[PDB]
């Protein structure tokens with residue numbers, strides 16, 4: 001068995017190897033990458049996502065989200081308070097202000113210590129989930145707006161034609177902006193490209209150990225657990241590495257820098273934070289190996305998780321028993 005310790009693997013494809021996206025994902029899995037739940041891909045040195053970022057300041061962040069924490073430093077939830085619209089140029093200037101900027105630090109480790117000590121005492125503003133792309137249309141390799149769609153994968157593997165579309169999303173971050181512990185919708189893959197700015201630190205639990213994280217989360221968030229049988233779908237709960245280690249939960253960590261891709265694999269729980277002003281682009285995707293994970297994915301039916309149009313068909317075809325109840329939550 002390849003990668004039996006479930007370590008995060010780092011790949012350096014050549015420009016030739018960067019042509020065929022599906023084939024490269026399958027290669028990484030042949031080497032055991034998926035067992036970690038997360039992999040890093042460093043693009044060949046010849047590749048670029050676009051020529052420059054000099055002209056992005058006029059993108060609108062229609063609903064910036066203030067991430068307000070409750071709890072203790074290592075075990076907390078966050079709620080998202082909606083703020084007034086602002087441009088990316090306005091948001092960048094806010095990120096760089098004395099109130100929001102990255103503090104002085106020695107290295108990524110010192111920054112990580114400061115994040116876990118102090119996150120709860122501040123409310124950073126995150127421009128998340130903005131439909132759009134920063135890849136140039138002429139970028140032919142690993143262009144996250146030109147991937148094969150999940151609907152087409154389901155049709156190729158299973159023969160059924162379904163409605164829905166699959167487009168990328170932009171994320172504008174600042175110091176302390178946080179992504180809570182989650183797997184993807186329908187336990188899909190994700191791919192995330194850090195276009196510019198400061199790093200993003202990731203934490204991940206191997207897919208084979210995901211249920212250990214869920215059991216800890218039920219213990220740590222006991223009212224949320226009674227409210228919903230899949231409350232991590234709400235994407236609000238944080239648990240620190242120190243708390244995971246105290247409770248014996250297997251995990252790994254890695255920091256993504258600008259110019260690098262990360263892939264999350266089906267049922268790979270992940271969480272993390274941004275170091276400073278940055279912009280990432282991410283999209284969900286599927287492979288043949290995903291189908292069985294999609295059939296078994298948990299679902300929020302309490303109504304809180306409220307998701308995309310295209311998830312309807314996935315539930316309807318892969319999980320017809322749950323359909324009915326899941327759609328009562330969505331309506």
Ligand SMILES: O=C(O)CNC(=O)C(=O)O
Pocket residue numbers: 171178179190191192264270280282283
């Ligand atoms: O970058 C972020 O805030 C969150 N991204 C992801 O969870 C992802 O790419 O799967």
Ligand SMILES: [Mg+2]
Pocket residue numbers: 055056057058059
């Ligand atoms: Mg612009």
Ligand code: NI
Pocket residue numbers: 182183184190264270
């Ligand atoms: Ni994710």
Ligand SMILES: [Zn+2]
Pocket residue numbers: 227228229230231233234300301302303304305
């Ligand atoms: Zn729920």
